[PDB]
Design a protein around this ligand. Structure first.
Ligand SMILES: CCCCCCCC/C=C\CCCCCCCC(=O)OC[C@H](O)CO
Ligand SMILES: CCCCCCCC/C=C\CCCCCCCC(=O)OC[C@H](O)CO
Ligand SMILES: CCCCCCCC/C=C\CCCCCCCC(=O)OC[C@H](O)CO
Ligand SMILES: CCCCCCCC/C=C\CCCCCCCC(=O)OC[C@H](O)CO
Length: 224
């Protein structure tokens, strides 16, 4: 009965490596996203770099406290509404930031799931002297954030319509600086730089996981 019982098991660890490697890819993507979204140093740098005080007709102290309040609001543990210290906000502006908050709690929710599956299924594979999930995952974390960008290559303007309508509850509403002046201290350059910082953290994440794959496999070879 052994023949038929390892044809099954070999295809099992092959699948488990797949689920674990994809779980590591998303876990690193979500961790990097959370580090940049809730990190303050990048935006604090953009204040002087992009001259946000003159962009928004605000002082630096006002920009930072309004930003600090926004990031506190986007945490999944703050149940209160968004109250900017010195800025007005329209009904559609509050709707937009609840949309932004909702994807973050969605990403974190799935992140906690993938982290557990990656570490639980990962030690099951390490107990079996199998390390390729640290290698398969390593390349998969580089490939995950970019597979989300693939629709851009088919149609640039059109597939940004798809992202916008999957995330946001108001199709047609745009930020009016008179009614939602926080838009003037969130320039487009900050969001692109933030996306680059996410991939930077993702790239660094795959390196350490690849380094772990090679640390494990060299010890495994120096044993046999
Ligand atoms: C040695 C094996 C490691 C096992 C032990 C560590 C396992 C956790 C793994 C990564 C850290 C993830 C921590 C959870 C990140 C919280 C998500 C988050 O930061 O959101 C909260 C808030 O919005 C922002 O301040
Ligand atoms: C997209 C790449 C990921 C970037 C990582 C995020 C880092 C930003 C930090 C906190 C969120 C700030 C609140 C988000 C503000 C959204 C404003 C908006 O809705 O877009 C502008 C609108 O299209 C014009 O009218
Ligand atoms: C290498 C790229 C890595 C991909 C990383 C993508 C992560 C997206 C997931 C959550 C973002 C949550 C915050 C959503 C903020 C979007 C607001 C926005 O994009 O508006 C900017 C606009 O272009 C000017 O105003
Ligand atoms: C079992 C597989 C082990 C694989 C080993 C690779 C682990 C990758 C760890 C970090 C890279 C992601 C970069 C994210 C930078 C730190 C993320 C973080 O934990 O901070 C969250 C933030 O502080 C919330 O407020």
């Amino acid at each position: 009965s052994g023949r038929e019982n390892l044809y099954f098991q070999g295809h099992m660890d092959r699948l488990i490596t797949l689920v674990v490697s994809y779980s590591i890819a998303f876990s690193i993507f979500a961790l990097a996203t959370m580090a940049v979204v809730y990190g303050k140093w990048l935006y604090y740098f953009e204040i002087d770099f992009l001259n946000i005080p003159d962009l928004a007709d605000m002082t630096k102290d006002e920009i930072k406290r309004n930003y600090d309040v926004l990031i506190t609001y986007l945490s999944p543990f703050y149940d209160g509404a968004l109250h900017l210290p010195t800025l007005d906000m329209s009904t559609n502006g509050r709707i937009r930031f609840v949309d932004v908050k909702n994807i973050l709690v969605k990403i974190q929710y799935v992140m906690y799931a993938t982290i557990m599956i990656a570490v639980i299924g990962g030690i099951y594979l390490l107990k079996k002297k199998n390390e390729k999930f640290l290698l398969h995952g390593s390349i998969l974390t580089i490939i995950f954030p970019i597979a989300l960008m693939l629709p851009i290559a088919i149609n640039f303007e059109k597939s940004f319509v798809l992202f916008h309508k999957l995330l946001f509850s108001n199709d047609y509403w745009v930020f009016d600086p008179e009614k939602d002046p926080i838009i003037l201290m969130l320039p487009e350059e900050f969001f692109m730089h933030a996306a680059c910082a996410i991939l930077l953290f993702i790239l660094g994440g795959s390196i350490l996981c690849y380094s772990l794959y090679r640390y494990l496999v060299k010890k495994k070879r120096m044993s046999q």
